[model samples]
Structure formats: structure tokens, C-alpha cells
Target: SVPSQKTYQGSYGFRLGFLHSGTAKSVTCTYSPALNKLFCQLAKTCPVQLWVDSTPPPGTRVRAMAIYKQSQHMTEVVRRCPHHERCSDSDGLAPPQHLIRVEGNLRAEYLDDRNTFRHSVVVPCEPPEVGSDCTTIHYNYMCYSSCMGGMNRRPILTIITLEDSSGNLLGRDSFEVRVCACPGRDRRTEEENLRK
Candidate 1:
């Protein structure tokens, strides 16, 4: 669900980096929005990988490669309203609170190893609402295969659910992209690899 308010009291941040051969370089930190997620653009002509981490301790990590001439990075937070207690008063207790659903679409160009370009797009499911029963959300991300494979390009949708209690998807969604792939693609990669 979209945010009820435009202000997020929660806090979030992301790190970007570029890895060449075996060395890693720090980029910079981008903070998440209090209300809606953020979309960022990567450098053109530079092949960079992307990684993102969410709030709570032991944050979740996502990895992707940027191939578009220009790519957009989007992040948005979804929250569930507090559940109401059952009541016997003349007025019925509050109805079951609805959970927030977060979704995003990423458009980019596919730059192959040979420098050939193809159009591609991806729709990713943001982290589930807080207190959601689901453990792992699925993100279906598809890309157009027109360069050397096919004619129509479909986005690969991906779903990722959280299991940690600290998985506070409360504030603005947090996401990022890198100019190059990293050696160790893990949670720390956001800090050690991608800084800006």
C-alpha cells in the first residue's frame, strides 16, 4: 500500500562501490526518504553493480547489475496500521488493519559484453509490510531480449520477504547501484563496495 503520510519517522541509508580486478572502492551513502522511496541514476558508459539494505539489525541485501544507458533506483516504505482490539461496546471494534504493499518498476538498457545495447525493464516488489506473515516476498524482474535473443523484452519481477523482527520497512525505501560488480557480494558489500 502507498504511504498514508508523506513523512517517515524511521531512518535508512545505502552504500555504493566499484570493484575492479580484486580491489574495492567506496562511493557514498544515500539516505532513504521518510515517506516515499528514492530513485537514483547511475553513470552512463560505466558498468556498475547495485546493492541495497533495509532497516533493523542485520539488514537485508539485494544485488543487481546496471546495464542501461541510465537507470532509475526507486525505494518506498509500507506500513501496517496498528490492529484494533476486539470490543463489545455498541460500536464494533475497528476492522482488521490492512497491510501495506510496496511495488517498483525499473527501466534500463541492456549493454552486453560486446557493447551492444538492448532495452530492458524490471518490476521489483518492495519489502513486505511490517508484521506480515509471509517470510519471503517474490520479485518478478524481466528484461526485453531484442539485442541478440528475441524481439519483445519482458521485465523479470522479483519478490523478497523479510523474516527479521527488526525488518522495519517503516520509512522511505532504501536502494542503490554500483558502477562495477563487487568481489564479495554480501551485506557488507554495500559499505565496503558501493559508497556513493
Candidate 2:
């Protein structure tokens, strides 16, 4: 069993560190009206590793990492709305299908908590070592709701939070990314393609 370690007491701020790679200026999601799909071109590199910072002795036994899709504006709370309703136009809901591959694992998964995905890491039972690795951030918004806000490029938030085994938040950070139709493409063709 790992020895008990004290939890962080002081404030901790996190920064998004990526494994050096990609040419994009930042994370971007572009919709393809023709295919009715959204694709994200991540910055830094393909399948980038989103490694957070941390360390400890005897560790807390287990630490958790969670990712949440947040609203860029104060008023646009993330929520689910029914189809054929106007609310779906403004309410933020979980994408029909999203993918998040856990660091050091092959299986990819997503969240049931609306727009948040939680993953926990078990530090080895060894008496020392504590911290989280990284999670591969990759997702594409598939629902039309994601594109209904009448904005050419909709910027949203993707936040990562670290927490103790007991769910005490240790630190956090975020990234701003856009969701929109593919740029540099003919808008007429794009709109015509969406006539599904």
C-alpha cells in the first residue's frame, strides 16, 4: 500500500502542455455540411498528448483527471434540449458521439455527465509516486445543434481538472477552440449539402 500523503492546500493553476507536434495555431473543429460531420484539427500534432503537471510522495494513492466542455459566454450554460424545439438551438448538449482516449490506454471513451468526461489513474501500489499522465484530446461535434447558433465560427471551452482520490479538485486549466463549417470551402455548396 502507498503511504498517505497530504493533499495540496495552496492554490494550484494548470497550463495546457502538449507533446511538441502540429501546425495549426490552436485546436479547431470544422463542420462538413456535405458529410454532416464535424472534424477537429488539433494544434501541435496529430493525436496530441494533453499532459498536465503534478507530483507527490507516497502519493494520494489515486488521482483523477476530468475534461468538460464549457461555455465561452457566461450565459450559455451547457445543457440538453429536445429535438424539434427552439431550445436546442441555444442549449448546449453532448455531441451525439465524442471520443476521448485515455493516456496509456488503447480504448477510447466519452462521458454520460452531459458534456464532462471523468477518468481516474491508479498510481502503482508502490510507496512512492503521484501524478497524472495525459489524455489524448480528440472529439468532433456531430449534432446540428452544435452549428445552429448562427455563428460562422463558434468558440467554446475545453477545461481539464485534476482531483484527489476523494474528488477534491487539485488544479485546473482550459483551452478555447472553435466549432464551425469547414473554412475556405464554398458556402453555397456547404449549405446545399446540409439540405438533408
Candidate 3:
């Protein structure tokens, strides 16, 4: 078993060290999105070892290597609307999806939360272009008293319903992201935000 290691608490960048010897294999850098699930690769070369550290151990000996370089490759990334970053018109939903951050190909509908007349939007998780990575595109939505509300403020929910071509239920999940009701007639203070 690997020795217990604490996640190195630090900014991201390429770093180098002598390690007294370069007998070790190539150093790798990893970027974690959540739950410490990270995708790592050999860091872009520059540092003596191209080692990217998240958090270094105490008594961390660098042997005098203060120089660092942050290699950010952002240029002419002509991606579409649903890219990594939120679009200015998308209004920036944390989970970003139909009726909210998502734009184009949204099938909006009304459902009962049932028997309660709730609003929702469904988008294709599986377009007819890719591999079996997608069999169907079933995303859902949510709101308060019905919809996100009024004219200028409403939080959109991004949900996906898993099923087959026959529309038989298979599985279901959501973004788990909720927004506080506001700018609406019946908007309420977020309980978690109310105490502020």
C-alpha cells in the first residue's frame, strides 16, 4: 500500500527538484475535478523534473528551487457554447443546463412533482453522432411553486434520466444544484443564506 499522503495544498504550476538523484521515473502532474479523482499526465517540460506539487510535505526540502512557471494553454479555443466556462448569456449556472445555462435543443415541458405541476426541460444525452457513450439524452429540470420564476431571475436545474429507446426507465440522476428563490413575487430567503 502506498504510504499515507496528504493532498499537497498549493496552487498549480510546474516545479523542479534535484531529489538528490534523478533515478525516479518521469514526474507527472494531475488536475482533480472532484472527490480527488484526478487525470494526470507528464507535465509540460521546463522544471528539472517537471513535477507538479499540490501540497508538499513538512520540512519540505527544495534545496533552493524558488523559480516556478504556470503553463496555461488558453488560446483561440473556438469551442461551442457548452464549453468548460459559462457563456455571458448563459447566466452562469454551477451545473449549467437547459432552461438555465444550456442553450439550443431543449425540449421544455411540464410535469407533476408531481400532480403539483412542475416545469422541466429535457435534452439529448446521446446525440446520433457519437459512440455508445450515449444511448439517450434525458436531462430534467426544477423550480419553485412551479418555475424558476418571474422575468429576470430563475435557477435552472440540469437532470438526466437514463432509459432505453423504448422509453423504459433505466436510471436517473441530477446535478444536485439548487438556487435560492429571488426577484420573484413569492421568493424566499435561502435557509442556508438567511442567517447571513
Candidate 4:
């Protein structure tokens, strides 16, 4: 049965990944059913560091870990290019940031209600310039093509896990979707950005 949003006693785990300019980076986090706390970690060698946004307000008892992995493709692109291209290369060599956010209702159960465990994620692109263009701008134009050059692209996984108390795993499920970014329709935009 599906979990309910209002009243449920369950937990959720999530993982997020993105391929920017070709390199792929990911992050994983979990939410506890008993405590309603959230924890997350950033990938090592990621271009932009991960920090909690004060707007959302971090929950209590949050824990995180960092894992390092070298991105050969990204490293090659950065090293080979004489100047940074505003647009990604044919292989899609760009630095992308992965984001995951999950909200659960601690008053619900693992079963009998579908909305008990709700999760959402965004794989936004890092802005070309600070305080001007957001990561979504690059991501949207390069990836989704739905947000008018905005990276509202959803995460690869949805409906992660349905766990019980005691930190014991009960059951897990996921929805699989292809992770591919679309090329922009306007070649002029690509050309202009690349020239810069």
C-alpha cells in the first residue's frame, strides 16, 4: 500500500547524481523515521562545495560524509581547453552539482499510506558567473530544455525506501529514469556562449 503524507511512521533514503560537461557527481542522504532528522554528504573533487541553505533550516541530528573520486573527463576538459567555454563540448564536458531534498511526515506508517515518504531532488548546473546566472540556467538549457534554460530537472530516483523503526531496513523500492541532458534548440546561444 502507498504511504500517507499526513500521518505515517516511516523513513526514507535518497541518492542524487548529475553529469555536467560529461563528468558525473553524486550525493546520498537519509531521513530517520523516529527522529525526523536529515543527513547528507557532498562528493569529493566537486567544483562547488556543498552547504546547507539557511532558508530551509537544517533539521536536528543531521550527519554527512564526503567521498573522493577523480573525474577523468572533467579534468581533461578543464586542462585541454585554452579558455572556458560557456557551453559544454560535444561530449558534454561541464561541472554539474547534484542536489537532494527529502521531507517526511513522522506521524505516518511505512505501509497503508503512499504519501508517508515524500522526496524530491534537483540537479542544477553551477552558474557560469557568481551571483548572476544560477546553476539551473546552465542545467536547464543544456539538460532539460523545459525550463527555458533552467535546471529544474528532476533527480534520477523517486520513491526511495519505506523503512521502520530500530534503524532496521524493512523494504526498499525505486523508479528508474534515463539521465540525459538535451541540447539547446538555439545554436546561436551556444555559439555566442562558446565564443566567450
On lDDT, the candidate that comes out on top is 2
**Error of model 4, residue 150, in angstroms:** 16
Error of 1 at 195 (Å): 9.5
In terms of lDDT, the poorest run of 10 residues in model 2 is: 1-10
Q: What is the lDDT of residue 55 in candidate 4?
A: 18
Model 4 Cα lDDT, one tens digit per residue, 85-113: 23333222222321222122232211111
Best by TM-score: 2
Error of 3 at 138 (Å): 12
TM-score against truth, every candidate:
0.18, 0.39, 0.25, 0.19
lDDT of 3 by residue, 1-196 (tens): 1111122223423222221211113322221112111111211211122233233222222211000011131111111123222433332331332222223234333222234222233333322244422122222111221221221132222223333344333333222222222211111223224445
Q: 99 in model 2: Cα distance from truth in Å?
A: 9.0
Q: Flag regions of model 4 displaced more than 4 Å.
A: 1-98, 103-155, 177-196
C-alpha lDDT of residue 78 in model 2: 29
List model 2 lDDT by residue over 1-196, tens digit each. Answer: 1111222332433333443222234434443334422335322112323343344323322232222223343333322223323333311333332322223322332344434332222332122125645545433332223544322234444444444556455554444333333322433344566674
Clashing pairs for model 2 are 21-44, 22-44, 22-45
Residue 110 CA displacement from its true place in model 1, Å? 20
Ranking by TM-score: 2, 3, 4, 1
Q: Pairing residues by index, what is the TM-score of model 3? A: 0.25
1 or 2: which has the higher TM-score? 2
